[PDB]
Design a protein around this motif. Structure first.
Motif, PDB file in Angstrom:
ATOM      1  N   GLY A   1      -9.426   6.548  -4.206  1.00 18.53           N
ATOM      2  CA  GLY A   1      -8.490   7.456  -3.564  1.00 18.53           C
ATOM      3  C   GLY A   1      -7.660   8.271  -4.535  1.00 18.53           C
ATOM      4  O   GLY A   1      -7.042   9.261  -4.131  1.00 18.53           O
ATOM      5  N   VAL A   2      -7.639   7.875  -5.807  1.00 15.71           N
ATOM      6  CA  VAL A   2      -6.803   8.510  -6.820  1.00 15.71           C
ATOM      7  C   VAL A   2      -7.421   9.807  -7.349  1.00 15.71           C
ATOM      8  O   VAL A   2      -6.699  10.775  -7.611  1.00 15.71           O
TER       9      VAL A   2
ATOM     10  N   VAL B   1      -8.609  12.516  -6.393  1.00 18.39           N
ATOM     11  CA  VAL B   1      -8.315  13.850  -5.878  1.00 18.39           C
ATOM     12  C   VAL B   1      -7.387  14.646  -6.796  1.00 18.39           C
ATOM     13  O   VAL B   1      -7.373  15.883  -6.723  1.00 18.39           O
TER      14      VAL B   1
ATOM     15  N   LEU C   1     -11.046   1.295  -2.219  1.00 18.52           N
ATOM     16  CA  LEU C   1     -10.223   2.310  -1.570  1.00 18.52           C
ATOM     17  C   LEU C   1      -9.005   2.655  -2.412  1.00 18.52           C
ATOM     18  O   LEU C   1      -8.548   3.804  -2.405  1.00 18.52           O
ATOM     19  N   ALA C   2      -8.470   1.674  -3.135  1.00 13.80           N
ATOM     20  CA  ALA C   2      -7.339   1.926  -4.016  1.00 13.80           C
ATOM     21  C   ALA C   2      -7.775   2.699  -5.251  1.00 13.80           C
ATOM     22  O   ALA C   2      -7.052   3.581  -5.726  1.00 13.80           O
TER      23      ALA C   2
ATOM     24  N   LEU D   1       0.633   2.737  -3.290  1.00 14.00           N
ATOM     25  CA  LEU D   1      -0.652   3.410  -3.436  1.00 14.00           C
ATOM     26  C   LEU D   1      -0.631   4.772  -2.754  1.00 14.00           C
ATOM     27  O   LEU D   1      -1.202   5.741  -3.267  1.00 14.00           O
TER      28      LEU D   1
ATOM     29  N   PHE E   1       0.795  -1.228   0.000  1.00 11.30           N
ATOM     30  CA  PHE E   1       0.000   0.000   0.000  1.00 11.30           C
ATOM     31  C   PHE E   1       0.830   1.281   0.000  1.00 11.30           C
ATOM     32  O   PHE E   1       0.253   2.357  -0.187  1.00 11.30           O
TER      33      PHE E   1
ATOM     34  N   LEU F   1       0.694  10.754  -4.294  1.00  7.94           N
ATOM     35  CA  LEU F   1      -0.005  12.033  -4.183  1.00  7.94           C
ATOM     36  C   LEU F   1       0.959  13.189  -3.930  1.00  7.94           C
ATOM     37  O   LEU F   1       0.777  14.285  -4.472  1.00  7.94           O
TER      38      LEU F   1
END
Lengths: 22, 15
Positions: free
Chosen positions: B5-6, B8, B1-2, A10, A7, A14
């Motif tokens: 979540g992208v 944004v 969730l994976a 993942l 994760f 950002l």
């Protein structure tokens, strides 16, 4: 579990594209 | 969730 360590790929993308030229 | 979540990144573009 190998997938309990996956994760971060993942979660880390950002903060990549915040600011490089402004 | 994976997957959700992208999206944004598209949320930042139009602001």
């Amino acid at each position: 579990q190998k997938i309990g360590g996956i994760f971060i790929v993942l979660a880390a993308g950002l903060v990549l594209s915040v600011l490089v030229a402004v | 969730l994976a997957y959700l979540g992208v999206s944004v990144v598209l949320f930042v573009i139009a602001r």
